[PDB]
Paper text:
To understand the molecular mechanism how TOST-1 binds to ERH-2, we made a similar fusion protein by linking ERH-2(1–103) with a fragment of TOST-1(34–54) via a (GSS)6 linker, crystallized the fusion protein, and determined its structure at a 2.20 Å resolution. In the TOST-1-bound structure, the ERH-2 homodimer is similar to that in the PICS-1-bound one. However, only one TOST-1 molecule (aa 35–54) is visible in the structure since the crystal packing prevents the access of the second TOST-1 to the symmetrical site. The TOST-1 fragment (TOST-134–54) adopts a helix structure with two extended ends, and the helix is accommodated into the oval-shape pocket of the ERH-2 dimer. The helix of TOST-1 (aa 39-48) interacts with both ERH-2 protomers, ERH-2A and ERH-2B, via hydrophobic and electrostatic interactions. Leu39, Phe43, and Leu46 of TOST-1 make extensive hydrophobic interactions with Val8A, Trp22A, Phe73A, Tyr80A, Leu10B, and Met71B. The main chain amides of Leu39 and Asn40 form are hydrogen bonded to the carboxyl groups of Asp67B; The side chain carboxyl group of TOST-1 Asn40 is hydrogen bonded to the main chain amide group of Arg85B; The guanidino group of Arg42 forms cation-π and salt bridge with the side chains of His6A and Glu26A, respectively. In addition to the helix-mediated interactions, the Arg36 of TOST-1 forms salt bridge with Asp24A, and the Thr51 of TOST-1 also makes additional hydrophobic contacts with Phe73A. By using ITC binding assay, we found that D67A of ERH-2, R42C and L39A/F43A of TOST-1, abolished the interaction between TOST-1 and ERH-2, whereas the ERH-2 D67A binds to EBM in a comparable affinity with the wild type (Kds: 4.3 μM vs. 8.5 μM). In addition, those mutants abolishing the ERH-2/TOST-1 interaction, including D67A of ERH-2, L39A/F43A and R42C of TOST-1, all demonstrated delay and nondisjunction in chromosome segregation and cell division.
By using functional proteomics, we and another group independently identified a piRNA biogenesis and chromosome segregation (PICS) complex (also named as PETISCO) that plays important roles in 21U-RNA biogenesis, chromosome segregation and cell division. The PICS complex is composed of TOFU-6, PICS-1 (also names as PID-3), ERH-2 and two mutually exclusive factors, PID-1 and TOST-1. The PID-1 containing complex is functional in piRNA maturation and processes piRNA precursors at 5′ termini via its association with IFE-3, while the TOST-1 containing form is essential for chromosome segregation and cell division in embryos. Complemented by biochemical and mutagenesis experiments, our structural biology data support that PICS is an octamer composed of two copies of each subunit, and unveil the assembly interface within PICS complex.
Residue numbers in the entry:
A (entry chain B): 4 to 44, 51 to 97
B (entry chain A): 4 to 43, 51 to 105, 123 to 142
The structure:
């Protein structure tokens, strides 16, 4: 398991920058879809999550790497690839 | 200069979590000193430590150019850096942006973004 920070900015305001942290990448991705599901409040296809992540002004993850004891920055594209695999 | 992400939670409410990023560690520390002054002229050492202790959460991700990855630093380390930056101003007893998404994407390709 890798401690994960989820960093988001929802509008162009710098004051919309928020973060959450999680004991697992799984927990962080789970947390991110829940954000999307609440905006949705229904089913949805991958395209809809993709569009949701595109409309964020900034979204990334910083994920603990045991080899280095340091965090790797992951992009929105990386995040969408994992969301896709959560849904295949 | 090491790109730094500053993670803050001002109150015990989870929705007071916010972050900022900076071109150097010094800039991120300076931002904390400015937060401290905004929450207040003159101040003593104890106020700076306890301002930092009263934050529900404060930590940094500091870029390490040799690994391309970020070192995490928590409150105990931040307090010593901030004290050193603030030591000369404390009373004592006696007497246009880059998003993280884009920056991480340039990094995944083998490049750093340099101020």
């Amino acid at each position: 398991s890798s401690h994960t920070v989820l960093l988001i900015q929802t509008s162009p305001r710098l004051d919309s920058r928020t973060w959450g942290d999680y004991e697992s990448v799984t927990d962080a991705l789970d947390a991110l879809c829940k954000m999307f599901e609440d905006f949705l409040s229904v089913t949805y296809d991958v395209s809809q999550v993709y569009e949701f992540l595109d409309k964020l002004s900034d979204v990334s993850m910083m994920i603990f790497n045991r080899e280095t004891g340091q965090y790797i920055g992951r992009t929105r594209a990386w995040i969408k690839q994992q969301v896709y695999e959560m849904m295949r | 200069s090491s790109h730094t992400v500053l993670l803050i939670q001002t109150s015990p409410r989870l929705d007071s979590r916010t972050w900022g990023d900076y071109e150097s560690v010094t800039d991120a520390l300076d931002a904390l000193c400015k937060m401290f002054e905004d929450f207040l002229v003159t101040y003593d050492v104890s106020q700076v430590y306890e301002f930092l202790d009263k934050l529900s959460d404060v930590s940094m991700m500091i870029f390490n150019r040799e690994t391309g990855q970020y070192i995490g630093r928590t409150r105990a380390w931040i307090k010593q850096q901030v004290y050193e930056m603030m030591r000369g101003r404390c009373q004592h007893p006696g007497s246009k942006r880059i998003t993280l998404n884009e920056r991480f994407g340039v990094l995944e390709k083998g490049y750093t973004i340099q101020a």
